[PDB]
Design a protein around this ligand. Structure first.
Ligand SMILES: *[C@@H]1O[C@H](CO)[C@@H](O)[C@H](O)[C@H]1NC(C)=O
Ligand SMILES: *[C@@H]1O[C@H](CO)[C@@H](O)[C@H](O)[C@H]1NC(C)=O
Ligand SMILES: *[C@@H]1O[C@H](CO)[C@@H](O)[C@H](O)[C@H]1NC(C)=O
Ligand SMILES: *[C@@H]1O[C@H](CO)[C@@H](O)[C@H](O)[C@H]1NC(C)=O
Ligand SMILES: *[C@@H]1O[C@H](CO)[C@@H](O)[C@H](O)[C@H]1NC(C)=O
Ligand SMILES: *[C@@H]1O[C@H](CO)[C@@H](O)[C@H](O)[C@H]1NC(C)=O
Ligand SMILES: [Ca+2]
Ligand SMILES: [Ca+2]
Ligand SMILES: [Ca+2]
Ligand SMILES: [Ca+2]
Ligand SMILES: [Ca+2]
Ligand SMILES: [Ca+2]
Ligand SMILES: [Ca+2]
Ligand SMILES: [Ca+2]
Ligand SMILES: [Ca+2]
Ligand SMILES: [Ca+2]
Ligand SMILES: [Ca+2]
Ligand SMILES: [Ca+2]
Ligand SMILES: [Ca+2]
Ligand SMILES: [Ca+2]
Ligand SMILES: [Ca+2]
Ligand SMILES: [Ca+2]
Ligand SMILES: [Ca+2]
Lengths: 522, 522, 509
């Protein structure tokens, strides 16, 4: 089990850091060319860190002091430990410490229990932005308490005592709204939403009293599907052990209100129909929902009965709730716009750190970093957004509460995301190995079917001049992270490498020794 | 079997009338908005009435007294009885008795045996036009007698005695020419031709004597895809399959025998090279050297029972003298022209009732009714055409014998068929639910992708000006019959709804709750 | 055994001749239609003549006086004798059958104090000659001693035949050994091949690298053997030194290409070696500096193959065009001088398109080989003795242009592209049975013949009875096959069709 024991060091959040693997007894770094997405997934799984968010090569969390291992992990991605992974050691030189690999996993939450008589109950205390703080009890349900107790290994939660029972706590209140269903064993797996979360009374601090028996386990259904979020999508209901849809007959805002308040998504904005979020694959359970908009559950409405319908899947009902938040850039480059409460709105530029811009760019899936620009008219929704390290979406980023207020264009935020594609380890900026950003991490392109047309499309994507050479076999050096593309069958005139046909987004049989490079004109 | 026992009432012909289905023990009608073509087909099949001809909603056969059932028959179409179909009842009332559904089935013949000691023997009598007439043996073969006996549940026939053995006949003599093959169960399944049939001797009347034993049971050749009974690809049946001729050395002499076998007289054209389509099925007849005098296709110098050596693209077809075709010349408004004996000619206007014009319009497939117009150079074949109820083709209609003669311009038949498209349940004639006529019954257009281009096409096809609003989800009520069109992708400039791309003429997953509608300028 | 005792007579080379199966006491020929590929294979095996090369019909080796047998041999193929095969008793002497087996070598020992010892002599082109020891290794001596029933070899001390025998030592006969005599260099008169065999028949030999999917002997993906499984070599740092090592190890001269990226197809086996650091001087590939057995970070998409100096390929460039031979990594022409009809037939058959061809005048590329003299029996040009390889410039007058008759043909037809369909396979002109012979089959046949689309697909022997055997029946052509050989059907025998069921085609004029 300690054959290749991984660990994360150099990170300021629990499940991110420079990857160090212990070969028996010596802790040593890993070059980013020897650590694929599958190996990072195995590393995050073994450390109980959840799913891999990003592979950060080039010593993102600082260079390690010691020795660099020369083994390329050929993990299949389903392994439980890094010891079970097959590796391909190389006798020759390995790498430089300026290219150590770092991995960001998804369990960054760092929530604990403080000021309790028995070690595992008390005031819930959360750490974001480098400072501990009390969580608000407005959205601290018993399911969140159950997940927290399971994470701290004390079984289930007895109660969430409201008020300052365990103490108000010396610090500020964190407004994060954990949306745990109770079925997950870590608060980092829960969908948390801290953007614009409403202010909290000082004395309304969340707490929890766990059962304390580890052997004690939780014992026992509506969901929204294909909505591009959490509070929108096709209304899917569960009955007779099957996920079924609701026909959009007489499906109005009252029905949407009921399903949105049942899911904890606030009121509703749209009661969509005609399969707005895609046709479902399952029996239609309800046909004519006659909810008054006041009851707390959808099944307790005046429907036609389970399975009693005259509808098809082409008209499955779906909803868009008030708590449905969306993000976009309009002119990636343009004005940052957040879609909350059914209305698009700009984001305040105040306290917009580099981390927040990077989070926005990663969320939009077009860069790892970005920069704020002056304006090149809609009101401002949120302001003072402060993204910590670890969230790949803006909605987990604490900020001032939502306020529908008018904003001058000067103090809104315009950001230009960095290039999707970069050239690394080259003498100039127009030559080197092709790197592309997708899926949270920088990756490479393999040299299979890497002719000069692919070099042409890469050069015209970076803005460089015409392509000169399309190198193969990692001429400029082995790359970082996963191999996103191989067999790119470009015609040489595409607007970007993404439109070019290829075996896309991982699963390429190529290694990092076959990294594709280009030589553009200065 | 009595759970849903259908019956047809209010019809002058045997196999048509208002649809009444016994829901256990109470007789009640069915609304026309919850009776598709599959349910009508099951109804016709169960009642031993052949295939369904047309679904006539709106109390075509009369107002049904009693109760209306709100059960939407979800019949697949192949059920033996209506009791075996899925049922999707709705709690609310469906419609009034003014929208009772009616169904016309194929077996309208009403043929019987009269003036016999035993019920399985006597003079053949037939009922068309409300008159019990005595069929005569001009074309009454032994296959017709066998089918008549089998229909009457009397096993097989013995002989067809000539003269007035069972009586001359108390009334007038029908000239119908049944072309039974001896295998179909009912005389209504036989292809009958009574148009222009030759005058028949008064003392020669068809009579049949059967075996009288229900246990008795009987122990081929056909023309396919020719637009009639006496044209199309020649098909020979043996070894349980139907096969076509290779066309090689397929002369008019080889066509004379195949035409005289079916009773279609002499042969006009001996076609080939898939002239009537690509005939799927093994080819087992090649190098036909028929001399013409013989009366069987298999009696020729056949190369062998399976010496295919050919392709379905070289399939043999024939055109016979008794092949009949109909058209309107001036789309489907103009002079009535009938194609007999290889020439086109007019049709006499004398005794041309509304039923005959409706039959012509249905057969040409462009309306359910029509109207006689004044004249607005070819001879006249047939005159005094009298269509009864039940036939959808003009060739099953008794008429004066084919008399090639010159006729004045003031006595032929000019008809203008009704519009293929209509708007129902609207305040004005240019607003309401769009209904189209196809396949014998008035269906509706579903609302899937029913935009204003569709409404523009419909409004310009009706006859009035531009559209105002293309309605959705049965704004003016659920329509009658099937749903012919859905997902109509009109460009907005098509002259008629039939030019727009669509999922046309059935197999549409829509329901009558999704009936498209329009609003046109008055 | 003597129930059906076969023999080959009327052949110049040892293991070829007209088939004459003996019915106990009387020898009698066989009609060409009553003898299939499996029967010929069993015949070749029984007479210790190795595998069958071709079945020659129409009295290729003359007509044998006697009684022709009407029996039909339903040999499965693996029978050790013609007696053991099932027989189906029920022709003319002009249709007698002959077979050419693969052990045509006729190599012997002369001038020795013992019958199992002496100088090696070989007989090709009808003249006994002294094979010499330019490439006479100890494996060839072992194979010769085993063939002569002399045990194993001990040491190797008319005109001179320059044949190169590439025996591995495990071959029971010289005909089984791969032999290359095309363009072999001259050889000193005093330097000839000899062998002293042990003379102990009870004595036996005792105990790998290979190239596969190369279309020859000295090219293809490098397969190395380890731990009981044949594995590949990754092409990482697989430069020309590694190819030199694996080519000189296999006796294939120097190397022209060290191919990678699975040029000769992706192997199916564990990649054994990854980073070959051969200096080009060691005699074995495993003696190179590598990452070690099994240590590799490669896939099968990058298997390492080579193309060696002795790799030879044959092509015709316009199956008609100038004859070209690919030796030493460079394509080149073949000399027209002394181009006998046998050599043209061998060339046409090796191109896989005929059994005969006509020498034609030309309608630049330097010349490799000249004075090529193919004997009877080889089916490849590489085994035909000739003048040595020489890189020289030639005018198109002395170049070789050959127009071979393609395997598909139509015969007894009013036009060129009408008649019964006949194919060529195994040295005999067969006919296709009209089982499921539809217009798709005729389309394929007409497209292969090079004329317009088919008009009719006749049956029932429309254009007369075909000669020879029947190779094809129940051909399921889809109408778009380039050649009739790509159509999925039971091919080259195992057909009960008679000549009355010969298929025919009618194409456009
Ligand atoms: C939601 O409703 C608003 C207000 O009626 C409308 O503007 C918007 O287009 C709707 N969006 C969807 C997806 O239905
Ligand atoms: C890229 O092209 C430039 C322009 O010819 C050349 O000077 C440079 O050496 C090239 N780089 C490589 C790595 O070949
Ligand atoms: C049929 O034959 C007649 C002549 O008898 C000719 O006028 C007509 O065009 C023919 N029609 C076809 C379809 O061959
Ligand atoms: C059609 O449109 C006009 C004008 O918009 C409206 O007055 C009329 O009521 C509409 N027709 C129907 C049936 O509603
Ligand atoms: C072999 O090497 C020569 C030398 O450049 C080259 O021209 C040829 O294309 C190569 N062939 C293969 C199959 O690699
Ligand atoms: C080939 O077909 C054409 C037309 O189908 C015919 O005229 C010709 O005689 C045929 N050739 C034969 C049968 O050899
Ligand atoms: Ca919560
Ligand atoms: Ca609906
Ligand atoms: Ca509702
Ligand atoms: Ca409904
Ligand atoms: Ca590669
Ligand atoms: Ca490419
Ligand atoms: Ca009849
Ligand atoms: Ca034929
Ligand atoms: Ca023909
Ligand atoms: Ca004929
Ligand atoms: Ca719809
Ligand atoms: Ca449309
Ligand atoms: Ca040798
Ligand atoms: Ca490689
Ligand atoms: Ca090397
Ligand atoms: Ca390697
Ligand atoms: Ca075929």
């Amino acid at each position: 089990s300690a054959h290749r024991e991984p660990r994360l060091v150099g990170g300021d959040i629990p499940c991110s850091g420079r990857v160090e693997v212990k070969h028996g007894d010596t802790w040593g770094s890993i070059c980013d060319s020897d650590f694929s997405l599958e190996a990072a997934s195995v590393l995050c799984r073994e450390l109980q860190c959840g799913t891999v968010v990003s592979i950060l090569g080039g010593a993102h969390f600082g260079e390690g002091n010691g020795q660099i291992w020369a083994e390329e992990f050929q993990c299949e991605g389903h392994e439980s430990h890094l010891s079970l992974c097959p590796v391909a050691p190389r006798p020759e030189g390995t790498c430089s410490h300026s290219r150590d690999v770092g991995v960001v996993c998804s369990r960054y939450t760092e929530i604990r229990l403080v000021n309790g008589k028995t070690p595992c109950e008390g005031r819930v205390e959360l750490k974001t932005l480098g400072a501990w703080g009390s969580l608000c009890n407005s959205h601290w349900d018993i399911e969140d308490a159950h997940v927290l107790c399971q994470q701290l290994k004390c079984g289930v939660a007895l109660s969430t005592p409201g008020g300052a029972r365990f103490g108000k706590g010396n610090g500020q209140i964190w407004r994060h709204m954990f949306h745990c269903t109770g079925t997950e064993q870590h608060m980092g797996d829960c969908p948390v939403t801290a953007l614009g979360a409403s202010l909290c009374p000082s004395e309304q601090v969340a707490s929890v009293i766990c059962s304390g028996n580890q052997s004690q386990t939780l014992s026992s259904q509506l969901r929204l599907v294909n909505g591009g979020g959490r509070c929108a999508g096709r209304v899917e209901i569960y009955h007779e052990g099957s996920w079924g849809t609701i026909c959009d007959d007489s499906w109005d805002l009252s029905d949407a209100h009921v399903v949105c308040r049942q899911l904890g998504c606030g009121e509703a904005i749209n009661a969509t129909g005609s399969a707005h979020f895609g046709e479902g694959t399952g029996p239609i359970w309800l046909d004519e929902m006659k909810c008054n908009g006041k009851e707390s559950r959808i099944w307790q409405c005046h429907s036609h009965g389970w399975g009693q319908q005259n509808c098809r899947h082409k008209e499955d009902a779906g909803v868009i709730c008030s708590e449905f938040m969306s993000l976009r850039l309009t002119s990636c480059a343009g004005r940052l716009e957040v879609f909350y409460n059914g209305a698009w709105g700009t984001v305040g530029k105040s306290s917009m750190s580099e981390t927040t811009v990077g989070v926005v760019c990663r969320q939009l899936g077009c860069a790892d970093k970005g920069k704020i620009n002056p304006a090149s008219s809609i009101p401002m929704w949120v302001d003072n957004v402060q993204c910590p390290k670890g969230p790949d979406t803006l909605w987990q980023c604490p900020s001032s509460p939502w306020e529908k207020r008018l904003a001058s264009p000067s103090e809104e935020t315009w950001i230009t995301c960095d290039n999707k594609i970069r050239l690394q380890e080259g003498p100039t900026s127009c030559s080197g190995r092709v790197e592309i950003w997708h899926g949270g991490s920088w990756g490479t392109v393999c040299d299979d079917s890497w002719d000069l047309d692919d070099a042409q499309v890469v050069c015209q994507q970076l803005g460089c001049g015409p392509a000169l050479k399309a190198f193969k076999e990692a001429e400029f050096g082995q790359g970082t992270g996963p191999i996103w593309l191989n067999e790119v069958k470009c015609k040489g005139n595409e607007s970007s490498l993404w439109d070019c046909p290829a075996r896309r987004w991982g699963h390429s049989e190529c290694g990092h020794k076959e990294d594709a490079a280009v030589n553009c004109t200065d």
